[PDB]
Amino acid sequence: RTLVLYDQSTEPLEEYSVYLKDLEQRNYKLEYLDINSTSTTVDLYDKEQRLFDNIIVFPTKGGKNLARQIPVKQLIKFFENEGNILCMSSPGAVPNTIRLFLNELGIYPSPKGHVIRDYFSPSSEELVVSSNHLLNKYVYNARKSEDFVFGESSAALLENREQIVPILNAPRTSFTESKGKCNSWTSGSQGFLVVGFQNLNNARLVWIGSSDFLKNKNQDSNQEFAKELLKWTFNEKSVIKSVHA
């Protein structure tokens, strides 16, 4: 019922098991397709119906591979029909296909070279983000202060849509530092680090603005945020039903 569209070229799949396995602890039939090697095309529908109800797209430098497996129009068709999506795009792997899809959805990620730099931070090593920036209590409500880790992050701008669902936020002193001279993409708390989107058919997409988040090394800091993120992204955390009106 679930796909896993990874790319062994940039970030192998081995280092994404601690959460993937957890999915199989619950009821989740997982299928895998390494765009980097495979040449055939995936099959999303059975008889004008949905073969797969979830999708996952780990980091990928971009190219004809995922463009052929899942083009923008096919993604939008699979979304309009109730189907959940999870995307990630660090400043090293920004798949143009996913970027254009999101832009179609109001979420404007940052381009290749731009990286979120942020002084006044707990550790110089990486972008540690405090638990104070969480915005939605129906996605993950922090109990005690925790610090999430983003190695190479990438913010995103947002339109004012009723459908968009901010989840995290960048530190107020953080800016996107392009190597080439350009305007700073995001600046401060107007640049988002984790975003969600709920379709008008109650379908759900979630964009994580980094590749070092869902990894295995950072499990201890991120264990309790990532699980609830996946739950919400897969319509298993906050679903509402109306009866006998």
């Binding site: 002084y119 006044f120 004012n160 936020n169 107020r172 002193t173 401060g188 708390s189 107007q190």
Partner: protein, 143 residues
């Protein structure tokens, strides 16, 4: 010694220059001077050699800031920056949120050079201005 000037919308409104915080690289304070259409406020703050320099104007408690970048001149052995805020070119959601909620629009300044020792960079609220106008919501905000 940067002088940030909010030209005007109308009249002149006022400034509550409160800091009420710990000693985070404090230096001289802002001095206001109405001398032209632009009513300029001159401040002399420390760590005057930063790589990133911005002015955030808004309400941090609601995440509605706006970033302004200054223009640097090379007078020599000096540090002057002019932030030109136009009160009629400010984001709609900001004026309306300032009106709806009686919370002052705070203007914070950030200088940091990416390599200075921790606590050598400045993140201090150098101004806190207030307005009393007629902000209409018949075309309401996205907020």
């Amino acid at each position: 010694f940067p002088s940030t000037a909010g030209k005007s919308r109308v009249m002149i409104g006022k400034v509550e220059p409160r800091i009420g915080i710990d000693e985070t690289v404090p230096t001289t304070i802002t001095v206001e001077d109405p001398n032209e259409v632009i009513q300029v406020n001159f401040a002399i703050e420390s760590t005057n050699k930063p790589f990133q320099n911005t002015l955030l104007i808004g309400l941090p408690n609601k995440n509605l800031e706006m970033a302004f970048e200054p223009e640097i001149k090379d007078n020599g052995k000096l540090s002057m920056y002019k932030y030109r805020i136009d009160l009629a070119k400010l984001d709609a959601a900001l004026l309306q949120e300032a009106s709806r909620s009686p919370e002052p629009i705070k203007a914070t300044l950030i200088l940091a050079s990416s390599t200075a020792k921790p606590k050598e960079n400045l993140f201090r609220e150098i101004l806190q201005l207030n307005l009393n106008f007629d902000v209409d919501h018949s075309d309401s905000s996205l907020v």
